[model samples]
Target: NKYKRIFLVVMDSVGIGEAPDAEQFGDLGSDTIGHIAEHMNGLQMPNMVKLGLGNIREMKGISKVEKPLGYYTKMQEKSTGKDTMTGHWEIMGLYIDTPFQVFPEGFPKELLDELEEKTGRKIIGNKPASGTEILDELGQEQMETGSLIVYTSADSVLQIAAHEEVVPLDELYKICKIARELTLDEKYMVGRVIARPFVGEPGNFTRTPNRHDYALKPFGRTVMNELKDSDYDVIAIGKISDIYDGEGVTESLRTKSNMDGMDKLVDTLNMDFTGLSFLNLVDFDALFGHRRDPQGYGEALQEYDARLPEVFAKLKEDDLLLITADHGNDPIHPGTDHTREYVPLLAYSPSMKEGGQELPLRQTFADIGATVAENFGVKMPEYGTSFLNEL
Candidate 1:
């Protein structure tokens, strides 16, 4: 193997610019980094600039250095969906032809009937709404009646929210599992079934870290599966394991925030493992992007930029660091939905004799997994052309 360990980090929803099929998804002129930079009147990410972030695309703030420290490019999503599960599965070399079905009007009565019968709890808020806002609206009712507050969003998710004291964490998880089983039918397939547990009464209710997601297993084998079958370690951080339903992951770590995710990553780097360490930082998407707070997004990027040097300094000779994003959630976009856009792909290693070349725009996010498979001398994925030789 060319590298003993490959650290693949996904800065979720940190898309660079809009893609070719942006209009098809009703997301035209959506440039995540571009708009953020413009809104901030110029954003500076010196460490990423050294890694060729500027050369990947035109931004009002970040600069393009003459000689970067690594190979850089942007990748397009080959999958049909712009959601987290599809984007992440594509990155691991699994192409999703049909996106998961979203329930804008909420789930069907038949499924709800089964769920209610199975869980012995009545369902409330069976519609599309924000998690926090729904809690604010029905938190008191749930606490008083002990009803399960079920809601969906623009994305393909069936979320079950309950007050910890009213439902109990284990009972909520069991109820979500029942919902998950019910959704597996073709009539009500969802991308994920999330258990959102909260504490306290109305007005001051807050989500807890005990939340869990039950996602559909990957439709086909991915590079992660191949790597695992070959006896290689596949450590997953944040929502990655849940994204894949824990299917090929040997070790899984959860995080509360982006900074916490970074802390776990640095801690993982300190350990010795031969394989892939995959991490997803979700705060950029969940906290800033969906909230449509460009200022907060810009500040988050700046904070992440300041922490890049710590990872850079600890890189081993054969350790390859591949940084990319899942999809785009442009804060300035029309609505709170994932936008069809290109994500940045930057590769760096301390052992490379020469670096800093701008590679061609990748046709698929699978190129990343393909590169990892090639580096590890494992089975190549079906979709992407590996850019390993150039690196």
Candidate 2:
């Protein structure tokens, strides 16, 4: 049988532990999964446990499954930074050497002045800050003056927070589009320009689900493009299309929450496809991790675990299911930022009952894309060695 389909789900920011070079990135001791399990007293992800989550790393609460039904390992990033775009791009066979510029002291005066001129709104809060925190601090000012609450984070992002009632979603998105275009030049190139819309009272502001990311297009061809070249279906769910700037994606599905993304994944899984279904469940990072809510992060994992069996039940004989993560957003980390940690790589197939075993430590995230290219008989990408033979 020539049957093959790969379902790759990126549990955004669900990292395991710090990488060897974590110290270099000031992310020593950053452990997303481990800390979450510890903070919540324990994690009870039976579906993931059975799939060898414990076998990949020794978490505080997750136990090892004796007969793990999947190949498990930790994949390190070879890219320059711990940001989402860097991680996702590395996963799809691109090793970014130079990191995207981050603005801890806020953006430059020249850039902000230009943005103010173009958008006709004065910019406030240009320093690095958490999204909700920024909203609470600046939301009142924004409502009063209709100014943009522009902020940055440890990641390479230019986040513009505005009151949805004050600026409206469409208008905010338009301003972000201009920012996106403005940042295309090297001097202002940031990884993403996010439109963070919020609502509610000044003291108790909350961001909405209408968050949008305007990311720089992939520097060159990716494995998705490679698959598309071979006439294979390339589907993107959640912000996966946004990360790639909608390039090479044949279909895009927006999701409201992590559960919503999973529900969409299950529905997409039922569709007949020869290629890939790439999905990102972002709540771990956006809601809990960045918010420093370990309990929330842990609960989100449990929710996904409960729904995992339904996904496994629908897999075809030759279908491969890959569950991995982009970057580390440990809730217990010192700051509200991504941690430079190794992400878990779980590869499972219903047909692997006999052959499923622990995989060796992967040197780069691109191994996933290489495996996909190998499975689809496409040319191996520029960045990684294929683990298809091992599987």
Candidate 3:
């Protein structure tokens, strides 16, 4: 094996700039890091700058270093959708040709009726609405009538919101599992069934950490599967396991926030693992980009950058660390959804002698999986060209 252990950290929704097909996705001028840097008068990510983050693109806050500490590049999405599932799946070597079904005008009555019947509860707010906004609009009604606030966004998801006192977390999760099974049908083929549980009263409703997502399994086997089949550990952190529906993950850990996720990451690094430790820090997207708060986004990036020294310190000579993003959620973008953009890729290893190495623009996100597959001597996926030899 090229390396004894590989650490893949996905800084969710941390896009550098718009992709070539950004205009087609209505995200022509969107730049997650660029706008955040401009808004914050420059981001304080010195560690990332050293990792060639600024070298990958021209951004205001970050400086392009003459001798970066590692390999750098930007990857484009090959999948048809910009949602979380598609982006994460593509990174693991699955190419999705068709986008999942989205419900803009609310779910059909027939499906809603079956869900209501199966769950023994009425459904309310069956429309495309923000998670917090939907709670303010119908949370009281849901509490009073014991109804579930079912909603969605631009993404291919069916979300159920409920008061903890009224519906209970266990019950809400059961209801989502039913929705998960129901959405598998062709007419209602949603990508995920989310349980958005919350507490508190009207005007002060807060989503609980009990939020759970039931994602459809990847259409094909991923690199994680290949590694696992070969007796290598596949440890998934944050929502990484859920995104793959726990298909290739041998062990999984849940995290409350980005800080906690980083804590878990550093803690995991201290352990001995053979194959892959995959992690996803979603606060950058969930708390900042989706809310259109560039200030918070920049601050989160700085916060993450502050934690990297510990990760670097824990690395062994044979340990390979890679950092990237699932997709771009530009806070300055027009809508609340994700933007079509290129995600940054940074590679580092303590054993490498060179200080700076630049990789060509990768046409697909699967190149990451291909590279890992090559290192582990596993079967490569149909897509992606491995840059393992170059590294």
Candidate 4:
């Protein structure tokens, strides 16, 4: 191959351990990978073990393998928030100094009133809530009056839930766009405004696949933009494009689930790509992690592990594989919020004749971007030193 390709997969919210300043974020005891192993009485992931998943750091039951086939390390977030946008932005070379706004007590009336005025619909619930639980609490009222179920969370977000049958998806997105616009200022700088559309009856409402995110654009150019400007392809799979607000993405594809994400990645490998293909598997974070289902999270991990071989096999001679996470969503952690923790950085290459050497702890998530930049021969990002030289 004349050019190398980097398949960057972010196993969303799969944090390996607590951050160095964990206590400041109230995440001192959280360990997404370690706690899950203990909770599941040891995780069954032989594929990952050989990739040095255990080498990043020690875990309860995940034993380190000798002379593994890949390099590994734990990376800390340089950005201010544990939310997806901050984590991903840092990974792509933008270190966020100011965290996005969040509403523990829900958004103020000023915001809600603006949303209601713009959408011409009365807003109903305005509190922090689980997407599913909020529907259970106010689905009936929302259905009756075509009301918007507006909510917030520990993450910097303003979510608006509407029953699919009551409020059309387009309208939901319209309101979310309005909300997104209103929250761009410093006092209301929400990271994302989400359109949470649900289906099924009020008694059994379920969030559908129609969720959309309106994000604040990156403050500065990302590695993606640098690559794109240098005439390299930067494809974003799943909500990756949305997270960056399509700032530097060349092609964007959305998946139904993690399984579908893997399918898309496998398919993308078949097509021609000269630079980066970014994928985010959200089932780990959204379905099991935040729900505090340790067993479910472990199962999902095994399922993904089982499929890694195919991805590895499909790697070309000059191809590189990177497995990492945006943040941590420890299942056993106290609340249903993302934890400020360290994420594992696993790197592999089909062309490497010798592997298994581990790197030191990464100070910033931007190291991944830096490495990608180095691999593609693009200018390295300003925020991080490339471990490609270390490799």
Measured by TM-score, the strongest candidate is 1
lDDT by residue (tens digit), candidate 4, 162-267? 8888898988988888888898877778988888999888689899989988878888898999899989899999989988899879999889988899999998
lDDT of 3 at 182: 94
Model 3 ranges off by over 4 Å = 101-122, 128-140, 143-147, 153-155, 161-178, 185-189, 196-213
Candidate 4 residue runs with Cα over 4 Å from true position: 1-3, 101-104, 113-122, 129-147, 152-155, 161-175, 196-213
Q: lDDT per model, in order?
A: 0.90, 0.88, 0.90, 0.86
Q: Residue 376 in candidate 3 has what lDDT?
A: 92
Error of 4 at 173 (Å): 5.4
Q: RMSD, each candidate, Å? A: 2.6, 3.4, 3.0, 3.0
Q: Residue-wise lDDT of candidate 3 within 1-391, one digit each (tens)? A: 9899999999999998999999988899999999999999978999999989988986887989998888999999989888888888899888987667778799999999999899999999999988789999999999899999999986678999999999989999999999999998868889889999999998999999899888888989999899999888999999899889998899998899999999988878987888999999999988899889999999999999999998888888888889999889999988678888999999998877777688999899999999999999999988888988887
User: Residue-pair clashes per candidate, as listed?
Assistant: 0, 0, 0, 0
Model 4 quality (TM-score): 0.88
RMSD of 2: 3.4
Model 3 residue 357 CA deviation (Å) reads: 1.2
Q: Residue 57, candidate 2: how far off, in angstroms?
A: 1.6
Question: Which of 2 and 4 is the better model by TM-score?
Answer: 4
TM-score of each: 0.90, 0.87, 0.89, 0.88
Q: How accurate is candidate 3 locally (lDDT)?
A: 0.90
Model 4 scores a C-alpha lDDT of 0.86
